[PDB]
Design a protein around this ligand. Structure first.
Ligand code: NDP
Ligand code: NDP
Ligand code: NDP
Ligand code: NDP
Lengths: 336, 336, 337, 337
């Protein structure tokens, strides 16, 4: 019931399509896809995936202008410049901007120029762009918004439980470290990169790198402005990441009280977004989890009664993608 | 000038031998080695190493009771039970206990029974065993000690800079997380293990696990008793690890002041033990570093003036081994 | 029907249970497991798998003596010594031996001493033990065999299509190499091992190691006695392997014909055993394939009309386990004691 | 002596510089580098290497136009378009082309348009470009060749011992497979790529991919035209590869004899090019070996007296680079313009 266009059929673009496919009675209708790769490439890389495994659905080529998924057809275009896109011609209502290169208002606006009605950036938007994290501040959304951001994968894992920590105990200050799976932005072997660390062989190193999730939390949760900072450590795993948040709170507490606070939310206002796991699991066990963040309850610690340490897992590819579909769903429900 | 016996020719045992080999005018004399493996195995695995690379020295078999290194001969025995060892027969002064199974007083004492004069455990000693970290409290050592511990690799990285942080700013409370390279204690593929997490495929997961380094710091630095706790995250790298320490201090400070405090120590009382790196490096760049801990100066952060976050690198195998040689050197210099 | 006991709940042991669980109207009944690790461990590792993913079934501990899967309770014992197992007491018909330590008659025989009626080794048997490969020589099995072998994962991948090659082109001689994923027998980090190459860090090296798969093929395809040989190259992947076979055939041929020969068999004789893939895929795309061998068609080459090169993929864990289930199924159907 | 310019400071480009740096009394003088990434980047990546380790030399930036290694200053420029390079202005004699994008005459020719006197491609040339393999056909090079190719890392590993086999046993036909470490052309995570197999996550798969190494061997050893073929299997290791060759030889032989043949050549003809290792080693033990091919003796097999299987290791980065240095050395010694 809503014409959606996928701009950039990469990890997020493909995960998004498969996430959408699995939804029941979806308000969205993916009609077109744009990628620098060919049509035979789109179908091949959509059907076979080194992380999600083979797609359980009939995926084949539909000529040279489209692909087929369980019968349904989806147009396939290719144009590095968004302005030259048939968005208007097709009456595209929403464009899923997942190229990683059109994050500001100028770049992302080119979709609007091409005739698109609205755009959702699958990443933090630079400049003055409204960003939303489902379960944290999506209510602030309004159809009047033509360009919106769904933040980063890390921000979607952090915001949900930081919100609980702040409402229940009151965060004073804090730092975070995310031991993150490597991503396409890194190099397979030591090679040129503006970030001299991300330039190093990704499957061979623990790669420290900056993160904006810490400060970005303040966007969706104003009360946290200037209260958090952090860094990231990219490690040799292909997917699934973990956040290590340490905060000083105003109200004294203890490990199990903190955990119970998370469970209360997980069962109510954050059901489907936040989860608490009591099992002694490892990263691979969290692949394909729909929630944005899963607290490893047994790792929660409190030092000196007011320094809380929380460990939360998140499938950076799949989990975030479900959040993209959710935000897109909201756009379709609060339309015109 | 001191008969040393290597009990357990594993990662630490082999690294220790190669570390010792590189020392100039060493007070130590490695005369014997004991391992569950054969003689041809000891020489092969000593000469070829997937982490340290090929040993630059002539290593060959010396029959069925010894091996040869650059000409020098070293006896090779094999006996799972230490009591049945020719320590007394050879007049062994010090035994480098690196089997990982004789960590308490009963088990490690068996070396003394076999005729050994003293034992140095290359790991935290369980029970009432004096533990020392060079550069932190080695002065407390006395020849009267028959069984001593050199703590863990993590404790040797943490203690050095925690000592500086506490003397210069006064630690109130803190938590730590070590993103650690996998070790032999983990499983290559999901298999039986008392620790249900360490039981999972090590090259495929981020594996949370308990650590005693946090509490162990209190042994070598009494003032820290009950002030720190922490966890470990084993990741898919074969060697080199990193500590992420967050502490609340009494004296307000800022990132560069903290770094300068580390440099001051690195240049004086902690020269050779602690180091500060201003380069934007990654884990592989710290392999074979002799220091116990290297602060990544650009990652240092301070939140709200009294919450300090420090990131320090350490070669868990090689770096720790140099510390083993150092403690052994001390034992030889404060002998009888 | 058949009372089955699993001895050694490792990769194959757990892949076996899950393989069995997926079968419909199984003639087998897994009633007990001998896990050295314990009940909590058996339940946890069965539920969570780094390769197979989370078992889609309700798995929990049952008291301190068993576990349950979707309600079916399975007893759990722990004795490293087979002779002390309550096999006779429980009336165990078939013991699935997947410890990797009781691969010879004296070892496996211990299960018989404990009362089990028959033992099936999930690996090449050592010595005079009959070995079978489903799709190649299973018909040779008889209820009289007290100790059988299901061969290795490599033999199960090779034998099937080698059989097609031989009967269709006549194999004169040949050699093969398997680029194999690492396994529990290798070392995570450089450490003691009888095989000085397997002693080296598995996730960091290309590790050459001997293989009996080539010779083992003669045990199931007598016609190829002393005609094949080869080695293995253990590489840094957790599961799924690939065999590279180069044979000199009597009949001059060409790639397209060789592939066509495989397709015929795959569609008939070896349906469910051998497969042919025309897609340009990679190792991971073959995880959880039930067949024991999948020919990569586009890689088939023929040099000088008589030198054939074949590349076949195989899930050394899941595909092999499915075969162990099939062989056990034959033991049940051929039973009648 | 020879004014050398490095175009493309990638894995080979940097391995080259370090290889050159280790040489004594080199006839080459590296005076400029064209790095798209910049000066700080060229200096940093030259100093810190995830595979080679930290360069044991004082490496720093020099102003904003150059870098220096142990005091020797090397200019750095950045133009993705070769035609605009100051080659003529600097009087560059030889351009080391390691970008992987100017592998044909029209591409490499751009360096000549910019004033360089000669171009040496660190990869198979596309089209009518003469290609050489040090130890096999270097003597065929003449100063008249303006654009040459040093072939691929796989061709440099195969050719050398294939030459020994052919002249000592006569190769009738053959096929090979190289279990190759991944390279920058593969994708870190599933992503767009002309080669649908190379598009797949490199550290997570066994990736089959085509190779020209077999055919390329004919360019340096004419005698083997149309006699060999093969493929490549990219595996999860960062560096070092291994070639698996299976050939049918005219003269009946046996493993011990084949190995002995390699040792003779290694000790004479191909000393410093071919080597023979009797140790049971693994991939990592061959990092930084100067030879371009090391025969794993204990793995040599012969099936039916005429089917020979050879396994040879090679550091596709460092060994190849050392060869690029040698070929450049021949350009200098054979110069005289
Ligand atoms: N991976 C993850 O865990 C998450 C990523 N994100 C964000 O999503 C974005 C993309 O990331 P990710 O999918 O991971 O990375 P990928 O590189 O896998 O996806 C980016 C895609 O953009 C495509 N592309 C680039 N330019 C164009 C263009 N101009 N027109 C059409 N297609 C184009 C690229 O095609 P080609 O390959 O041909 O160059 C590539 O397929 C980034 O903003 C990232 O931060 C957010 C959450 C999670
Ligand atoms: N790796 C690292 O980063 C560090 C490890 N350590 C500590 O050092 C110890 C060993 O660790 P590590 O070297 O890493 O592990 P390894 O398993 O590589 O070394 C342990 C060795 O003990 C040998 N061994 C076991 N029992 C005996 C015995 N009874 N007699 C003779 N030899 C025996 C084992 O032989 P076999 O393999 O035949 O069973 C193995 O070679 C542990 O205490 C560990 O915590 C401390 C600092 C750093
Ligand atoms: N992995 C694969 O791809 C294939 C393996 N195989 C074969 O199957 C066998 C096992 O291999 P795999 O599962 O891979 O390896 P694992 O090591 O994962 O399994 C072996 C199991 O045997 C258990 N065990 C050892 N001794 C005993 C005992 N005495 N009593 C009870 N349990 C015991 C071990 O327990 P613990 O860990 O407590 O020591 C371990 O769980 C081998 O014969 C192997 O060659 C065949 C086909 C495929
Ligand atoms: N790696 C190995 O094992 C071997 C590789 N080779 C061959 O060498 C070549 C390069 O391979 P490799 O070093 O491995 O790969 P890399 O990608 O690491 O090196 C290629 C380099 O070319 C640079 N580059 C691209 N275009 C230009 C340009 N127009 N001007 C200046 N610099 C440019 C790239 O810069 P940037 O990253 O900024 O895009 C990159 O640094 C290929 O021909 C390859 O087949 C041969 C033997 C061995």
């Amino acid at each position: 019931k809503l014409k959606v266009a996928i701009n950039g059929f990469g990890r997020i673009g493909r995960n998004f399509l498969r996430c959408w496919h699995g939804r029941k009675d979806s308000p969205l209708d993916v009609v077109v896809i744009n990628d620098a790769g060919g049509v035979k490439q789109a179908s091949h890389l959509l059907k076979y995936d080194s992380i999600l495994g083979t797609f359980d659905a009939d995926v084949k080529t539909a000529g040279d202008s489209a692909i087929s998924v369980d019968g349904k057809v989806i147009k396939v275009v290719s144009d590095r410049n968004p302005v030259n896109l048939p968005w208007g011609d097709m009456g595209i209502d929403l464009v899923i901007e997942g190229t990683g290169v059109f994050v500001d208002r100028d770049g992302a606006g080119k979709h609007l120029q091409a005739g698109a009605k609205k755009v959702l950036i699958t990443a933090p938007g630079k400049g003055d762009i409204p960003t939303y994290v489902v379960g944290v501040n999506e209510e602030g959304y309004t159809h009047a918004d033509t360009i919106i951001s769904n933040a980063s994968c890390t921000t979607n894992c952090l915001a949900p439980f930081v919100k609980v920590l702040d409402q229940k105990f009151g965060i004073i200050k804090g730092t975070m470290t995310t031991t993150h799976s490597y991503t396409g932005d890194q190099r397979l072997l030591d090679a040129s990169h503006r970030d001299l660390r991300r330039a190093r062989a990704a499957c061979l190193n623990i790669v420290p790198t900056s993160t904006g999730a810490a400060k970005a939390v303040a966007l969706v949760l104003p009360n946290l402005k200037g209260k958090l900072n952090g860094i990231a450590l990219r490690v040799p795993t292909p997917n699934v990441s973990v956040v290590d948040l340490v905060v000083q709170v105003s109200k004294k507490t203890f490990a199990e009280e903190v955990n119970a606070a998370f469970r209360e939310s997980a069962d109510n206002e954050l059901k489907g977004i936040l989860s608490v796991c009591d099992e002694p699991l490892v990263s691979i066990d969290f692949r394909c989890t729909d929630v944005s963040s899963t607290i490893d309850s047994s790792l929660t610690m409190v030092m000196g009664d007011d320094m809380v340490k929380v460990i939360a897992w998140y499938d950076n590819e799949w989990g975030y993608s479900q959040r993209v579909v959710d935000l897109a769903d909201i756009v379709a429900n609060k339309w015109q």
